């Protein structure tokens, strides 16, 4: 992909976080093949001397005595000398990978989890706007995690993001409404998070624990840690969190109708571990928000549709109430523009264009009509930045930053073109986006940027996007012309 942020193979770093232990076994004798260098944390004896041993001679009796439900469920609670641990299994590179990490200590967590689910599945939830949905999603995740700050972060069209909503304890500073470059979460990070929706950085300042040996010897590269709960993250991102003053981090992928829409990102000023079962509870809340968002969006799409269907009906009644088509369209100007949420429309019904609302002058309409007759667009053409593809109108963002054109004749140049002004938006970046990272001379190390202080730009010359109901309304109005 684009830069070297994207090139770091974050699933192949060969380290796990220090609060857990990892063990990987091969073949039917279950021979210890990959083990973390801290494995004495939970194995009585030094890990390098257990490379090669069958699992019955490696693992504590405790874990062994739970081996059956472990194998069949992929997850079980074990009570070690060192406390209650949560043991997880998965498969990677032809190995069975056992991960142990401290287990949930509150017997009532799940009970607490069901109560915050209620807040978010609630009878008529999200009824005071989807902003209120985002806030409640932030509120319930922080209520359940104890994280100092919880945010809802949304990826925009170019994969830079913005904070839509924030929930934070009193005195925490936040980033509500701020924008962040796409490189802050690079492309191979976003692909990993599409397949693994959860990740915890329990202590941003702790050192990664290496795996032994540093390659899986069959393959000659490190063990793949894509599906590991204990995967230690890219050192650059740990530096990023240090620069933010963040001691611990936990984020959840928001997948909406197949694709990565955003994250629920949590941060804490001190280290903080969240149990595997408490993070699975937070995942239920994220899927719940994604469900509520989809439901609310489809409903909005449906209600908008009915509005445009009401309109063409009111225009149909209006025609055939007397007069010519140009006559009734002129009187029904407001409805004609409403169909696509436009400020103006030019109709080429044969002769010189009929100009309704604010449109460019007659001559600019004639030039554009002649140019649209050249392009390939089947039946309808639309853009929200006319000026990047049609320079003669590039300076008239006041009346024609976006257009929506429909063909009224096969080879002839007959069209309805709706126009939209620009919509200026003043955005605050968290840091200077022209300098999204501080590379070392020679560009081999790379470091995060040093400051996240507000940096303001106004985006000009672009209209509100054309909505699906806009294109539907226009297609339906071609018949009447
Ligand atoms: C040149 C490389 C860069 C880089 C690398 C990077 N970032 C990664 C993960 C990650 N970044 C964020 C960003 C944010 N956290 C916030 O709170 C906000 C806004 C308020 C932002 C924009 C997040 C949330 C994550 C996910 C991990 C987490 O802490 O929850 C990764 C992948 C880490 C991994 O191993 O998975 C990489 C490689 N960041 C840069 O800024 C540049 C320099």
Automatic annotation (TrEMBL):
It is an enzyme of class 2 (transferase). GO terms for molecular function: phosphorelay response regulator activity; phosphorelay sensor kinase activity; photoreceptor activity; protein kinase activator activity. The keyword Transferase applies. Residues 129-287 form the Phytochrome chromophore attachment site domain. Its EC number is 2.7.13.3. This is histidine kinase. The keyword Hydrolase does not apply. It catalyses: ATP + protein L-histidine = ADP + protein N-phospho-L-histidine. It comes from Stigmatella aurantiaca (strain DW4/3-1).
């Amino acid at each position: 992909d684009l830069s070297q942020c994207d090139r770091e193979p974050i699933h192949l770093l060969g380290g796990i976080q220090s609060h857990g232990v990892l063990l990987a076994f091969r073949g039917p004798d279950r021979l210890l093949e990959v083990v973390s260098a801290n494995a004495q944390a939970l194995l009585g004896r030094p890990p390098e001397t257990l490379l090669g041993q069958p699992v019955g001679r490696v693992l504590p009796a405790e874990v062994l005595a739970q081996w059956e439900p472990l194998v069949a469920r992929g997850s079980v609670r074990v009570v070690l000398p060192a406390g209650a641990y949560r043991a997880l299994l998965h498969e990677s590179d032809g190995l069975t990978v056992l991960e142990l990490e401290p287990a949930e200590l509150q017997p009532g967590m799940e009970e607490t989890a069901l109560e915050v689910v209620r807040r978010l599945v609630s009878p008529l939830a999200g009824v005071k706007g989807t902003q209120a949905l985002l806030q409640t999603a932030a509120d319930t995740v922080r209520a359940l995690t104890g994280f100092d700050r919880v945010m809802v972060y949304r990826f925009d069209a170019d994969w830079h993001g913005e904070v839509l909503a924030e929930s934070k304890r009193g005195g925490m500073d936040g980033f509500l409404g701020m924008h962040f470059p796409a490189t802050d979460i690079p492309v191979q990070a976003r692909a990993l998070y599409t397949r693994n929706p959860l990740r915890l950085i329990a202590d941003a300042r702790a050192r990664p624990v290496p795996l032994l040996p540093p390659v899986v010897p069959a393959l000659g590269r490190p063990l793949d840690l894509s599906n590991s709960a204990l995967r230690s993250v890219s050192p650059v991102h740990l530096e990023y969190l240090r620069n933010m003053g963040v001691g611990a981090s936990f984020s959840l992928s928001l997948l909406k109708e197949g694709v990565l829409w955003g994250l629920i990102a949590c941060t804490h000023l001190e280290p903080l571990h969240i149990s595997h079962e408490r993070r699975r509870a937070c995942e239920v809340l994220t899927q719940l928000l994604a469900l509520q968002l989809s439901a609310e969006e489809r409903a909005a799409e449906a209600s908008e549709d009915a509005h445009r269907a009401a309109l063409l009906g009111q225009l149909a009644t209006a025609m055939g109430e007397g007069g010519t088509l140009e006559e009734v369209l002129e009187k029904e100007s407001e409805r004609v523009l409403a169909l696509t949420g436009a400020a103006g429309v030019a109709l080429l019904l044969g002769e010189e264009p009929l100009l309704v609302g604010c449109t460019p002058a007659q001559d600019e309409v004639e030039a554009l009509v002649a140019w649209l007759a050249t392009q390939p667009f089947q039946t309808s053409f639309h853009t929200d930045r006319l000026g990047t593809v049609y320079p003669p109108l590039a300076a008239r963002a006041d009346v024609a930053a976006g257009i929506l054109a429909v063909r009224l004749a096969p080879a002839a140049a007959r069209f309805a073109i709706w126009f939209r002004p620009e919509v200026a938006r003043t955005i605050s970046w968290a840091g200077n986006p022209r300098k999204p990272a501080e590379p070392e001379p020679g560009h081999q190390r790379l470091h995060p940027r040093g400051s996240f202080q507000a940096w303001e730009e106004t985006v000009r010359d672009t209209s509100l996007p054309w909505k699906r109901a806009d294109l539907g309304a226009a297609e339906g109005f071609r018949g009447a012309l």
